[PDB]
């Protein structure tokens, strides 16, 4: 459905890596990911 990495879910942050690529930071379990949690639907 609607994705468009711009707004993130609760506990989810997004930052830029020195390489230029953006990565997501989950405040909940202190994990980082390069994958987009909006284009994948948890259900």
């Amino acid at each position: 459905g609607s994705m468009e990495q711009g707004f993130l879910p609760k506990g989810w942050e997004v930052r830029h890596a020195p390489n230029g690529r953006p990565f997501f930071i989950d405040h909940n379990t202190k994990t980082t990911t390069w994958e987009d949690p909006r284009l994948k639907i948890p259900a």
Binding site: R15, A17, N19, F23, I25, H27, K30, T32, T33, W34
Partner: peptide, 11 residues
């Protein structure tokens, strides 16, 4: 190819 900085690392 490289891992991203940890939350405590970037804070």
């Amino acid at each position: 190819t490289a891992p991203p900085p940890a939350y405590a690392t970037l804070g």
